[PDB]
Design an enzyme around this catalytic site. Structure first.
Site, PDB file in Angstrom:
ATOM      1  N   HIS A  20       0.797  -1.226   0.000  1.00 58.94           N
ATOM      2  CA  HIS A  20       0.000   0.000   0.000  1.00 58.94           C
ATOM      3  C   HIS A  20       0.831   1.278   0.000  1.00 58.94           C
ATOM      4  O   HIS A  20       1.456   1.617   1.004  1.00 58.94           O
ATOM      5  CB  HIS A  20      -0.913   0.004   1.231  1.00 58.94           C
ATOM      6  CG  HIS A  20      -2.011   1.023   1.178  1.00 58.94           C
ATOM      7  ND1 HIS A  20      -3.211   0.789   0.541  1.00 58.94           N
ATOM      8  CD2 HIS A  20      -2.093   2.275   1.688  1.00 58.94           C
ATOM      9  CE1 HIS A  20      -3.987   1.853   0.665  1.00 58.94           C
ATOM     10  NE2 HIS A  20      -3.333   2.769   1.357  1.00 58.94           N
ATOM     11  N   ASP A  22       0.335   5.364  -1.147  1.00 60.37           N
ATOM     12  CA  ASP A  22      -0.645   6.371  -1.559  1.00 60.37           C
ATOM     13  C   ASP A  22      -0.129   7.509  -2.432  1.00 60.37           C
ATOM     14  O   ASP A  22      -0.662   8.621  -2.384  1.00 60.37           O
ATOM     15  CB  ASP A  22      -1.343   6.965  -0.324  1.00 60.37           C
ATOM     16  CG  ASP A  22      -2.472   6.089   0.195  1.00 60.37           C
ATOM     17  OD1 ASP A  22      -3.439   5.848  -0.561  1.00 60.37           O
ATOM     18  OD2 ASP A  22      -2.398   5.644   1.361  1.00 60.37           O
ATOM     19  N   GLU A 123      -9.048   1.431  -1.833  1.00 58.93           N
ATOM     20  CA  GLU A 123      -9.090   1.480  -0.376  1.00 58.93           C
ATOM     21  C   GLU A 123     -10.426   1.970   0.172  1.00 58.93           C
ATOM     22  O   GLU A 123     -10.598   3.154   0.476  1.00 58.93           O
ATOM     23  CB  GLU A 123      -7.938   2.346   0.157  1.00 58.93           C
ATOM     24  CG  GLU A 123      -7.855   2.364   1.683  1.00 58.93           C
ATOM     25  CD  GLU A 123      -6.602   3.036   2.223  1.00 58.93           C
ATOM     26  OE1 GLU A 123      -6.012   3.885   1.524  1.00 58.93           O
ATOM     27  OE2 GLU A 123      -6.211   2.720   3.367  1.00 58.93           O
ATOM     28  N   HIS A 150     -12.836   2.053   4.815  1.00 54.77           N
ATOM     29  CA  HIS A 150     -11.712   2.900   5.148  1.00 54.77           C
ATOM     30  C   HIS A 150     -11.981   3.224   6.624  1.00 54.77           C
ATOM     31  O   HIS A 150     -12.347   2.320   7.382  1.00 54.77           O
ATOM     32  CB  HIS A 150     -11.628   4.169   4.294  1.00 54.77           C
ATOM     33  CG  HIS A 150     -10.385   4.961   4.556  1.00 54.77           C
ATOM     34  ND1 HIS A 150     -10.408   6.249   5.048  1.00 54.77           N
ATOM     35  CD2 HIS A 150      -9.078   4.603   4.501  1.00 54.77           C
ATOM     36  CE1 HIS A 150      -9.172   6.647   5.291  1.00 54.77           C
ATOM     37  NE2 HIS A 150      -8.346   5.668   4.969  1.00 54.77           N
ATOM     38  N   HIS A 191      -8.089  -1.718   8.003  1.00 57.72           N
ATOM     39  CA  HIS A 191      -9.162  -0.767   8.323  1.00 57.72           C
ATOM     40  C   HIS A 191     -10.475  -1.322   8.868  1.00 57.72           C
ATOM     41  O   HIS A 191     -11.185  -0.617   9.584  1.00 57.72           O
ATOM     42  CB  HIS A 191      -9.493   0.092   7.096  1.00 57.72           C
ATOM     43  CG  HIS A 191      -8.514   1.191   6.844  1.00 57.72           C
ATOM     44  ND1 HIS A 191      -8.561   2.396   7.509  1.00 57.72           N
ATOM     45  CD2 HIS A 191      -7.449   1.262   6.009  1.00 57.72           C
ATOM     46  CE1 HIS A 191      -7.570   3.163   7.094  1.00 57.72           C
ATOM     47  NE2 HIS A 191      -6.880   2.499   6.185  1.00 57.72           N
ATOM     48  N   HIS A 212      -2.071  -3.094   4.801  1.00 56.44           N
ATOM     49  CA  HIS A 212      -1.271  -2.270   5.698  1.00 56.44           C
ATOM     50  C   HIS A 212      -1.836  -2.265   7.121  1.00 56.44           C
ATOM     51  O   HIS A 212      -2.564  -1.365   7.524  1.00 56.44           O
ATOM     52  CB  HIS A 212      -1.076  -0.829   5.146  1.00 56.44           C
ATOM     53  CG  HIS A 212      -2.340  -0.057   4.896  1.00 56.44           C
ATOM     54  ND1 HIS A 212      -3.326  -0.481   4.029  1.00 56.44           N
ATOM     55  CD2 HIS A 212      -2.738   1.157   5.348  1.00 56.44           C
ATOM     56  CE1 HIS A 212      -4.274   0.437   3.958  1.00 56.44           C
ATOM     57  NE2 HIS A 212      -3.941   1.443   4.749  1.00 56.44           N
ATOM     58  N   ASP A 320       2.662   2.070   3.632  1.00 58.62           N
ATOM     59  CA  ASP A 320       1.718   3.186   3.708  1.00 58.62           C
ATOM     60  C   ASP A 320       2.412   4.502   3.365  1.00 58.62           C
ATOM     61  O   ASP A 320       1.972   5.577   3.783  1.00 58.62           O
ATOM     62  CB  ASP A 320       1.071   3.287   5.098  1.00 58.62           C
ATOM     63  CG  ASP A 320      -0.184   4.146   5.085  1.00 58.62           C
ATOM     64  OD1 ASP A 320      -0.964   4.019   4.117  1.00 58.62           O
ATOM     65  OD2 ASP A 320      -0.402   4.933   6.030  1.00 58.62           O
TER      66      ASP A 320
HETATM   67  C1  LIG Z   1      -5.617   8.152   4.205  1.00 62.47           C
HETATM   68  C2  LIG Z   1      -4.590   7.148   3.651  1.00 62.47           C
HETATM   69  N1  LIG Z   1      -5.079   6.608   2.373  1.00 62.47           N
HETATM   70  P1  LIG Z   1      -4.317   5.697   4.731  1.00 62.47           P
HETATM   71  O1  LIG Z   1      -3.498   4.656   4.056  1.00 62.47           O
HETATM   72  O2  LIG Z   1      -5.729   5.090   5.153  1.00 62.47           O
HETATM   73  C3  LIG Z   1      -3.428   6.248   6.211  1.00 62.47           C
HETATM   74  C4  LIG Z   1      -4.037   5.935   7.611  1.00 62.47           C
HETATM   75  C5  LIG Z   1      -3.154   6.577   8.702  1.00 62.47           C
HETATM   76  C6  LIG Z   1      -3.117   8.104   8.854  1.00 62.47           C
HETATM   77  O3  LIG Z   1      -4.198   8.724   8.840  1.00 62.47           O
HETATM   78  O4  LIG Z   1      -1.988   8.614   8.979  1.00 62.47           O
HETATM   79  C7  LIG Z   1      -4.347   4.427   7.784  1.00 62.47           C
HETATM   80  O5  LIG Z   1      -3.955   3.627   6.906  1.00 62.47           O
HETATM   81  O6  LIG Z   1      -4.994   4.089   8.778  1.00 62.47           O
HETATM   82 ZN   LIG Z   2      -4.068   4.626   1.962  1.00 61.50          ZN
HETATM   83 ZN   LIG Z   3      -5.231   3.065   5.119  1.00 61.04          ZN
END
Ligand SMILES: C[C@H](N)P(=O)(O)C[C@H](CC(=O)O)C(=O)O
Ligand SMILES: [Zn+2]
Ligand SMILES: [Zn+2]
Length: 391
Positions: A20, A22, A123, A150, A191, A212, A320
């Protein structure tokens, strides 16, 4: 040679398949997809965790590019298509370094030619707008996994960071898992709530993943995986891809964030409030209580426990990067993986254990999804069920 030198040698043979990253969302938010403004063929260390040179230095051989979109904003489907378009454009712009990958075979083909296999993972189930046909369209466009939720619950699945909703997966939620099984799309349980994890494992006929997520036993936080769920991975055949998010892996960070959130509410602000006034309050908190910093050792602690409970054949890595603001020391950006591998070598992990962690488990799991899909596609046609009918 040093453990770091050995780590690099091992990664050259069996590189990291990261679950994962982003970068797409970061490009969307930072420059609204103006790729020339963040050309990853150049050094982007000042703005991003990711770029081609650092991915190579880090030993990344395959990347599941996240096509995440916010679940608290309308037009999720349109936004998801724009995220997918971003990934496609990146692949087209850098043919010398990237190769689109839709199958396990594509991943090996990429590794054989020295290019980074580029896959996509959605996601959040909100990306399909309660439509199975839309799920199939995403698969047709190249999406190979979908995190069921999410941070918030959706109509058919409960998120770990929301209040109980349907109790895990609803009837339609199970239908979504069945369709993902038929299409060959990996069910991602990062998640989601523990209840959702168990419901998904009960329903899925294919190996599932956690793109992740780390260990809840090591660090009690809802975003991490409970031991009872990890224990079911061997039977399911899936894998948990450890993440680096400090506020999830470091106990001090989990506690710090909880206290920061309480402090925000103490001033009458929702913990997610980003107004200038709210930021002033948070700044004051960090002033009297510095943010704790995680290390490579912190992440290794999670992998050690995950290996003990889930088994070495059911582990992966999902950094991540570019999806979270803070990183552990030694894992500051995508070039840091060798530091983690070196630490594991120092802890006694074998070369074959590490090849599974980085490359082999991920390829096996995607191949398995394809295998299950072949059987289901030959056994029945696609589902035409609606959420109204089932829920
Ligand atoms: C918002 C991102 N796509 P994510 O990949 O969902 C990052 C968050 C952690 C954070 O807010 O820093 C998580 O994975 O739980
Ligand atoms: Zn993410
Ligand atoms: Zn995430």
């Amino acid at each position: 040679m040093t453990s770091l030198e050995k780590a690099r040698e091992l990664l050259r043979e069996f590189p990291v398949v990261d679950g994962h990253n982003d970068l797409p969302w970061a490009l969307r938010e930072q420059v609204r997809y103006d790729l020339d403004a963040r050309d990853i063929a150049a050094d982007q260390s000042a703005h991003l965790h990711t770029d081609l040179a650092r991915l190579r230095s880090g030993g990344v051989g395959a990347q599941y590019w996240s096509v995440y979109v916010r679940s608290d904003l309308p037009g999720a489907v349109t936004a998801t298509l724009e995220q997918i378009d971003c990934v496609r454009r990146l692949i087209d712009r850098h043919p010398g370094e990237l190769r689109a990958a839709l199958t396990a075979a594509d991943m090996e083909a990429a590794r054989a030619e020295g290019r980074i296999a580029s896959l996509m993972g959605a996601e959040g189930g909100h990306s399909i707008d309660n439509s199975l046909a839309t799920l199939r369209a995403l698969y047709a466009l190249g999406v190979r996994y979908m995190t069921l939720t999410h941070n918030d619950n959706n109509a058919w699945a409960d998120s770990a960071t929301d209040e109980p909703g349907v109790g895990g997966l609803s009837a339609f939620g199970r239908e979504v898992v069945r369709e993902m099984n038929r299409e060959g799309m990996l069910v991602d349980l990062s998640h989601v709530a523990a209840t959702t994890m168990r419901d998904a494992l009960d329903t899925s006929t294919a190996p599932v993943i956690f793109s992740h997520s780390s260990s809840r036993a090591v660090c009690d936080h809802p975003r991490n995986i409970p031991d009872d769920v990890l224990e079911r991975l061997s039977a399911n055949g899936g894998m948990a891809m450890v993440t680096f998010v400090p506020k999830f892996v470091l106990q001090a960070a989990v506690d710090w964030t909880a206290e920061a959130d309480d402090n925000m509410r103490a001033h009458g602000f929702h913990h997610l409030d980003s107004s200038p006034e709210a930021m002033k309050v948070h700044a004051a908190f960090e002033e009297r209580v510095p943010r704790p910093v995680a290390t490579v050792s912190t992440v290794a602690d999670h992998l050690d426990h995950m290996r003990e409970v889930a088994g070495v054949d059911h582990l992966g890595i999902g950094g991540d990067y570019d999806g979270t603001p803070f990183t552990p020391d030694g894992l500051g950006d995508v070039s840091g993986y060798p530091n983690l591998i070196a630490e594991l070598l120092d802890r006694g992990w074998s070369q074959s254990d590490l090849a599974k962690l980085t490359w082999k488990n991920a390829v096996r799991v995607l191949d398995a999804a394809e295998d299950v899909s072949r059987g289901l596609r030959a056994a029945r046609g696609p589902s035409n069920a609606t959420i109204e009918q089932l829920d």
